[PDB]
Every structure is written in structure tokens, then in C-alpha cells.
Amino acid sequence: SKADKALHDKFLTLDTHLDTPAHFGRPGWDIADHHEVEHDFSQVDLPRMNQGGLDGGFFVVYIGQGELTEKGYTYARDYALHRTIEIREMLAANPDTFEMALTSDDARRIAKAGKKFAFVSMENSWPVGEDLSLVETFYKEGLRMAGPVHFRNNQLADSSTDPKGKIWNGYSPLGLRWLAEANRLGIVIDVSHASDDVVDQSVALSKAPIIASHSGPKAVYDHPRNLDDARLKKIADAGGAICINSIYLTDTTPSPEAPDMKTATPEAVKAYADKRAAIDKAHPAARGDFDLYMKSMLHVLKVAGPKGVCVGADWDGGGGMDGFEDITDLPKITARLKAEGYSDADIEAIWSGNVLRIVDAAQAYAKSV
Amino acid sequence: SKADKALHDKFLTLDTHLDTPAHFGRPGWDIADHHEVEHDFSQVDLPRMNQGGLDGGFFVVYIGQGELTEKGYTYARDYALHRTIEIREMLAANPDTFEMALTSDDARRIAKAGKKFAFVSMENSWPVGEDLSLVETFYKEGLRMAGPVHFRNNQLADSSTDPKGKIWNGYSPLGLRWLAEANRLGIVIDVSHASDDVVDQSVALSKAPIIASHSGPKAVYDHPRNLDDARLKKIADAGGAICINSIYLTDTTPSPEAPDMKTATPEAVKAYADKRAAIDKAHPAARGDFDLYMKSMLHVLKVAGPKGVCVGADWDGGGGMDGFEDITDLPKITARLKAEGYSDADIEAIWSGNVLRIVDAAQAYAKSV
Ligand SMILES: [Cl-]
Ligand SMILES: [Cl-]
Ligand SMILES: [Zn+2]
Ligand SMILES: [Zn+2]
Ligand SMILES: [Zn+2]
Ligand SMILES: [Zn+2]
């Protein structure tokens, strides 16, 4: 709807968890090209950012949880460094359309120049190993938001989803030092994936507001990956925010009825995409729809307020629902917010204001020391 | 001379020590632009690579020797990682004219496609600190040639020029392990800057041929930075080679008669360049000339043979002589070699064949284990 795009276009938009960097190392993949989620599996690229009115976001440096050993740590360090480098290479290859942002002023300046701004975030800090000086290493290369853990516990903190249960009851002693270093450098702490203990300790100990880069409310869907109302409010009352995820909102159990993207031939990739597409069409996956996404956002808005909510759909990280396939559908969020009675001020806060405020606060504290 | 360029153009050329990366971080500096050594201080860029017929080379990740402390090592690690990243950014910004090479096949393939090939080398391995796993970290980002030390001794080995003398009498115990790791990964060991003890131990212990990325013969000029005939032959007899340097060939003592390039204003840089130029014109520095460069090359050729000699002039690292100001003068080397009676086969070996053979051997050993 051109009417929706017009309204949407008036706001500075950003998503706090673009997993798109996972595609950067794919042979011949170019963010400048237009892709189809059905054929490429990607949900983000420049053409679609323009079509969906997405002005920028936090490009994720993500790594799955591996061994808590010296070999695991060295592997993780190198892997994350390389993923960070891939992001910097994308930016170096697209200077006229993209630019790295380190501060909120950078974001606004880049936006005014007509370019997409790219902040850098980390999902799973397993890569720092036992050497916290690596946090600054990543900071020097652009890191401005980081979560200590992913799906399983690591040397820094407990995950909300580890099948083996808790081991630290929040942050490990090393993790507490990690939190202190993130605060000192001015990196926004991301609790998405972390256990409730980590959330509680983060709010209690962090010198700056924290964030949940991609989470939801247990009130809408009871899953460890979501937060109860009390914690949503706690994060918000401390100046933080929760960015709305598009998954963990419904039972995805499938009805009774992949190649290495970094080395597979373009034909091979097309092959699986085609088979997959047919399967998804014959027996659609249970993902919920756009109304469900707004149901989640609206509930968090009620509990955390318009200043404690943001957008983090998990694009390229498994996100997506019926009527919310990729970023081209983002304008629908702005439409529903208006239709729900939210002012432009609140919509602006939700699309970027709240996140940029959190970034400012984190970096303000860092400067103060 | 178009006649010289025609001959020169027939060979695949590469220099083993392009310090050019030191300019990559300079504000607005672009390798695609044409520069004048007199105004920009640079001796390498795409236009001049084309004019001089330089097909590629090893782009250096260099760092001066600092403190042998935890603080020094973390600083060195981060610095070298950033310099490596700057090189990768240059490559990402110039995909149609440049491409990173990891193997000799890459070099030839890239050359055939009409692009300049860029290998990555390290000068001073101080950045690995006490953590040898970092060697692989750099390897994963492109490192294929590395020297353990620079002007002063470090935690890995003795330098040939440290004013305080020797401390390890070659490699330290950590340095021996470093040599073993370089061999295991398939990184070519570079002894330029290392003490004679390091040279002797490298030939005796290395599982693969080694190289002197930019050195000369003591026979022509007696300086610690050059090698005696016995060591030249030793390196060659082990399958290695010595790449001819353009400095340390004459007494540079000046007759009786600079801003931060990364932060100075284009005008300020021009200012110094102009003053400097006038000074260099009024009272030329003692640098020798092109004949002296060939005198060095010819002597090493006599001792090491046509299979143990290569080119490493120290461009952007202090190299240059009268009649050999920058890479536009490279064709003169090919002319003199012919004029001296060397076949095309030998000239080809000297310009790239020998180096690529050494790279192949290093990587062949790595694969074998
Ligand atoms: Cl997730
Ligand atoms: Cl030198
Ligand atoms: Zn993710
Ligand atoms: Zn996630
Ligand atoms: Zn150098
Ligand atoms: Zn040097």
C-alpha cells in the first residue's frame, strides 16, 4: 500500500537483530542484489530495505555454542573475527549505499545522506574465551551491542534454553567481569537468549540500560525464550527496551507430513530451495501470522510502555510469519500502530528512538569513566 | 621505453614486500588513484602498477617493535588485526581490479583475469604474543608469509639490528614453536630482519624452503641487514630465495645540510611534502642508483643462482634510489637481466617463479601433515 509506505517512510527505522551477515560469505552473494526469500532463503538486502523502508539496523556477528575449552575458545575467537571482517568487507564494497554507525549521531547523519546505517552487534560472546581484552578488540572493530550467551550455557552465563539446566545461576564470575567491561566500553548489553537470572543480575548490576534485541512476552506465548511481565517492566523501568521477535509466539510443531551455503553450487542451492518451497507450499509450517506479531508487540507496549519497545524480528535468523515474510512487510507495523492509536512520537520511539536512546546512555556512561 | 615495457609485460611479476598497506588507513587515500612519490610519499598504486607492469605481490602487515608485556602483546595483536582488515577492505573496495591470492594457482588465475593479485605477509610477528594460536588466526584471514622479527629482538627471536645485542642466540623456545606452527600451517618463513643465528636455525629446522622477503648481499654492502655469501647459498641450496632490497646498499649518512598521515589535513600533508621535496632537491639524500640495485641482484644471482633470487625493493617501506623512484621503474630490471644474458626462463623465475615455487612447497608440506 503506497499510503502505508508514505506514513512508514516518515520514520527513521532500525531492527536490532539482522542476522544477514550469515549470507555475506556465500559465494557470489551480494547485498546490492534483490533476492526472493523463496529462492535465496534471505530476508534482507538493499533493494528490499528500500522497498520495506528499513533505514538501518544492528548487523549480527553470531556463533553457535561450542566447547568450553582452549580449542573451542580459539576457534570461536577466529570465527567471530572473520564474521566481523565479512561485515566490514560488505561496507567497504558498498560505500555509496551503506556506512557503519558507531553512535546515534552517526545513524542520523548517515540516514540524512541517504545511506543505510549499520551498527555491529554480537550474539553469543563465547568468542571472548577467558580473555576479556577481546571485548575491546571487537569494540575497536565496531561492536556496540552484545549478548553474553546463546542457546546453551557458556563460560559467561546461563542460557534460558540449555537442556542441561543452569550452571551459574546467572552470570559466572567471569561473566560478571564481562558485564563490567561491556559497561566500561559502552557496549549495550543484550539479554535475549540469557536466563531470567541473567536478566535480573543485568538490571541490578549494569551501569547502563540494557536491551533484549529479539524477544517476546510469555503472556502471549509461554516459552523460556520470552519474558514474564515483571521482567519486561523491570527492563523498561531501568531505561531499557524489548525488541519484538517474530518467533517463539506459537506452537511450531510440524504436521506428520540442506547444502553448505558457503560451498554449494548456485544450482545445488536452487535445487534445495525449490524442493523446500514445494514442501512449504504443500504442508505450510505453523508460524502464526502478522496479527500474532502485533499481538506480541501490543502486549509488551502495554507492560513496558512506548519507551521500552523496539523491533527485532530475527530476519535471516529464522524469523518470518504469514503476511510477514521479510522486510518488505515492515510498513504494516507502522500502519497497525497508527490504527491502534499510537502517536508519531511513540511510533518513532519504537522504530529507532528507544534503541538510539539506550545506545546513547551506554556510551554516555562509558565516557563518564 | 615502450620496448622495455613490451619485454617486461611478457612476465608475471610480483614483489615480496609491498609496505603499501601503511597508506590504506590514510583519510581519503585510494589505491585506485594515481599518486606522485614526491607529493604523496607513496610508491605504489593501481595506475603505477599498470605503468610499471607489476602484476601483484605480498602486501605487508607491519608493526614496529614495542614492549614485551601483556599490554604490548594485546596492543600488537589488535594493531595487526586492524592492519590486516585494512588490506581486506581495500580488496573489498576494488573487486574488479584486485583479488586476494592464497595459492600460486590463485595468482595465475587472477592474473589471467586481468586483475592484480594480493598475497598477505607479516613483518614482525610480535603480534602473536605468547599465544601461537594467533598464527592460525592470521592464516585464516589470508596470511601466507611471515617474518618472526623486525628491528629489535622480541619474544620469538633475535633481530640482526638490535643495539642491545642478542638475547636468544637465534629463536627463543617460543620462537622454535612458532617456526613449527608456521611450517604446519604452510606459511612461508621470512628471515629478513632476523639475526644470522635465526637464519641458520631456520634452514636447519624448517620443514620447507624459507625466504628473505627484502634483503641484500654483504659482499656489496657490509650491513647486518644483509647476508654473507655462505648464508645466501645455504638458503638457496635448501630451495629458498633472497628477494633484492633497494636499501642497505650504500652509506646513507646525510650531508651536514612529519605530520600524522592518519589524521593530518590534506593541505598539511602537502605542506610537508613540498618542504621535503625542496630539501631533497637542494640536498639529495645518498641512496645510490639503479646500477647499484642491479649490482646487488647480479651478485646474489652469482651466489644463489637464478632459482634463489627474487624482487623485494621495500616499496613504501623506505626503498627507492636514483633512477628507481617507484614501481614505474620496474621494467628496467627486466631490461638489464636480458642485457646481462639471462634467458626468459630465468627472468620469469626471478620475477615470480621462485617465490611461487616456495609458496607451493610450504603449502605442500602443510597438506602432507
Ligand atoms: Cl532465536
Ligand atoms: Cl628494512
Ligand atoms: Zn541471531
Ligand atoms: Zn537469536
Ligand atoms: Zn616493511
Ligand atoms: Zn623491512
Residue B242's CATH number: 3.20.20.140
Q: Best of B89, B98, B130, B134 to disrupt the A interface by mutation (most A CBs within 10 Å)?
A: B89
- Quote the CA–CA distance of B303 and B314 in Å, as a whole number: 22
Print the SS3 string covering chain B: CHHHHHHHCCCCCEEEEECCHHHHCCCCCCCCCCCCHHHHCCCCCHHHHHHHCCCEEEEEEECCCCCCCHHHHHHHHHHHHHHHHHHHHHHHHCCCCEEECCCHHHHHHHHHCCCEEEEEEEECCHHHCCCCHHHHHHHHCCEEEEECCCCCCCCCECECCCCCCCCCCCECHHHHHHHHHHHHHCCEEECCCECHHHHHHHHHHCCCCCEEEEEEECCCCCCCCEECHHHHHHHHHCCCEEEECCCCCCCCCCCCCCCCCCCCCHHHHHHHHHHHHHHHHHCCCCCCEHHHHHHHHHHHHHHHCCCCEEECCCCCCCCCEECECCHHHCHHHHHHHHHCCCCHHHHHHHHHHHHHHHHHHHHHHHHHC
Residue type, A26: R
Q: Cell match 637542494: residue?
A: B282
Q: Best of A24, A29, A133, A143 to disrupt the B interface by mutation (most B CBs within 10 Å)?
A: A133
Helix axes B104-112 and B354-368, enclosed angle (nearest 10): 130
| DSSP-derived secondary structure for A67-134 | -SSHHHHHHHHHHHHHHHHHHHHHHHH-TTTEEE-SSHHHHHHHHHTT-EEEEEEEE--GGGTT-THH
Count of all residues that appear for chain A in the document: 369
Resolution in A: 2.0
Residue from A244, A247, A262, A345 nearest A302 by CA: A244
Distance of CA A192 to the CA centre of its chain: 9
Q: Are A34 and A20 in contact (CB under 8 A)?
A: no
Whether B28 has its CB under 8 Å from any CB of chain A: the answer is no
- State in Å: Cα A317 to ligand 1 middle: 7
Residue from A120, A174, A165 nearest A143 by CA: A120
- Residues of chain B with Cβ-Cβ distance to A140 below 8 Å are 78, 82
Number of domains, chain B: 1
- Quote the CA–CA distance of B97 and B33 in Å, as a whole number: 12
Handedness of CA A337, A338, A343, A345 (dihedral sign): positive
- Residues of chain B with Cβ-Cβ distance to A78 below 8 Å are 136-137, 140
Strand partners, B321: B324
Q: Are B154 and B125 in contact (CB under 8 A)?
A: yes
Residue from A76, A83, A80 nearest A22 by CA: A83
- State in Å: Cα A296 to ligand 4 middle: 17
Q: Are A347 and A334 in contact (CB under 8 A)?
A: yes
| Annotated binding-site positions of B for Zn(2+) | 17, 19, 123, 193, 214
C-alpha cell at A115: 545511506
- Quote the CA–CA distance of A196 and A191 in Å, as a whole number: 9
The partner residue sitting opposite A85, judged by closest CB among B74, B88, B95, is B88
Pairing of strands B14-18, B56-62: parallel
Residue from A123, A6, A117 nearest A53 by CA: A6
The three-class DSSP label of residue A225 is coil
Neighbours of B322 (CB within 10 A): 15
The partner residue sitting opposite B140, judged by closest CB among A78, A92, A133, is A78
Strand partners, A205: none
First-residue to last-residue Cα distance in chain B: 49
Burial of A36 (0-12, 13-18, 19+ CB in 10 A): middle
Neighbours of A341 (CB within 10 A): 7
Q: Are B318 and B42 in contact (CB under 8 A)?
A: no
Q: Pseudo-torsion of CA A64, A310, A86, A114, nearest 10°?
A: 170
- Residues of chain B with Cβ-Cβ distance to A81 below 8 Å are 81, 137, 141
- Quote the CA–CA distance of B208 and B240 in Å, as a whole number: 9
First-residue to last-residue Cα distance in chain A: 49
- Quote the CA–CA distance of B73 and B308 in Å, as a whole number: 34
A77·B141 Cβ contact <8 A: no
Neighbours of B162 (CB within 10 A): 18
Residue type, B181: E
- Quote the CA–CA distance of A11 and A237 in Å, as a whole number: 25
- Quote the CA–CA distance of B266 and B248 in Å, as a whole number: 32
The three-class DSSP label of residue A64 is coil
B141·A82 Cβ contact <8 A: yes
Residue type, A235: I
The three-class DSSP label of residue A145 is strand
Q: Are B248 and B216 in contact (CB under 8 A)?
A: yes
A90·B92 Cβ contact <8 A: yes
Distance of CA B340 to the CA centre of its chain: 25
The three-class DSSP label of residue A190 is strand
Q: Are A270 and A314 in contact (CB under 8 A)?
A: no
Q: Are B333 and B311 in contact (CB under 8 A)?
A: yes
A93·B88 Cβ contact <8 A: no
Whether B141 has its CB under 8 Å from any CB of chain A: the answer is yes
Domain that holds residue B207: 1-369
The three-class DSSP label of residue A267 is helix
Q: Are B111 and B12 in contact (CB under 8 A)?
A: yes
- Quote the CA–CA distance of A188 and B206 in Å, as a whole number: 47
Structure-determination approach:
X-ray
- Quote the CA–CA distance of A18 and A213 in Å, as a whole number: 10
Whether B69 has its CB under 8 Å from any CB of chain A: the answer is no
The distance of A93 to chain B (nearest Cα, Å) reads 5
Per DSSP, A156 falls in state S
- Quote the CA–CA distance of B227 and B215 in Å, as a whole number: 7
Residues 6+ apart with CB under 8 A from B314: B17, B19, B214, B245, B246, B247
Residue from A39, A36, A23 nearest A278 by CA: A39
- Quote the CA–CA distance of B57 and B64 in Å, as a whole number: 21
Strand partners, B62: B123
C-alpha cell at A182: 561491556
Q: Are A166 and A197 in contact (CB under 8 A)?
A: yes
